[PDB]
């Protein structure tokens, strides 16, 4: 699905697999199979093992739509988790369904 | 209570919604369409135009033009004249 393989989790996994490959301890075929399994696993996790709603407000700076992926760039945003506020100056939302 | 007022019949909304969601049959680059046609040729010797459309998932007019460019249709006396994927 190649969407969640940019986050810190997916980045760390890619880097670990690269360290294992350059150390000649694993094949790239098994590595890409592990990556696909990771995508399935993180989708199942975020769908089932996560229940918390945030609410954000911002001034949408730009947006974009192509091949079923929205790319919002918002400015001066406040995210609102359970009880805490998280204020960010600029945030990119890459959404894909 | 029969033929009682409905804004739309439920079947009509369901089918129309499905067609809208399934959307458009994109015309893929000739090369990709050709590769799919040749790859599927191994499975069976001959294909029907209607059945071939589902496998390739391409416009009928566009698919026919591609098929005409290489493929030909042979008259069969058992069911009807059907397209043969072998150009020769």
């Amino acid at each position: 699905y190649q969407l969640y393989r940019n986050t810190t989790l997916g980045n760390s996994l890619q880097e670990s697999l690269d360290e294992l490959i350059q150390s000649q301890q694993i094949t790239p075929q098994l590595a890409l199979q592990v990556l696909l399994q990771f995508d399935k696993a993180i989708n199942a996790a975020l769908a089932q093992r996560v229940r918390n709603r945030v609410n954000f407000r911002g001034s949408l700076n730009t947006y974009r739509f192509c091949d079923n992926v929205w790319t919002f760039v918002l400015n001066d945003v406040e995210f609102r988790e359970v009880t805490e506020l998280i204020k960010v100056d600029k945030v990119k939302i890459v959404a894909c369904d | 209570t029969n033929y009682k007022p409905v804004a739309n019949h439920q079947y009509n909304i369901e089918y129309e919604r499905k067609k809208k969601e399934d959307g458009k049959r994109a015309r893929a680059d000739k090369q990709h369409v050709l590769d799919m046609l040749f790859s599927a040729f191994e499975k069976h010797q001959y294909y029907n135009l209607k059945d071939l459309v589902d496998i390739t998932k391409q416009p009928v007019v566009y698919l026919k033009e591609i098929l005409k460019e290489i493929g030909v249709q042979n008259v069969k006396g058992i069911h009807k004249n059907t397209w043969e994927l072998k150009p020769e």
């Binding site: 810190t8 760390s12 360290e19 996790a45 890459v94 | -």
Partner: protein, 88 residues
């Protein structure tokens, strides 16, 4: 919650690929090495999510977003639903 979720994902991935590692002929010590290396390596604001509905009025955007991992201020947050508003 974010570290617990990450640990869950790591454990799931390790548990599900154990058989492949066994099969292709790489010892499970390499698997545990992968797991510890991942857990160790684990230690711009971007929100990678799915969209359930991006509705738009004349200028008011309303995002209903599904499962998502945001990276706000160097800190990763997790949401199962994000109902945001914006004005272009």
């Amino acid at each position: 919650t974010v570290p617990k979720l990450y640990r869950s994902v790591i454990e799931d991935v390790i548990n599900d690929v154990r058989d492949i590692f066994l099969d292709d002929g790489v010892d499970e010590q390499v698997l545990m090495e992968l797991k510890t290396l991942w857990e160790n390596k684990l230690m711009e604001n971007v929100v990678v999510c799915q969209y359930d509905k991006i509705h738009r009025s004349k200028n008011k955007w309303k995002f209903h977003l599904k499962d998502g991992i945001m990276n706000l201020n160097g800190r990763d947050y997790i949401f199962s639903k994000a109902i945001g508003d914006a004005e272009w």
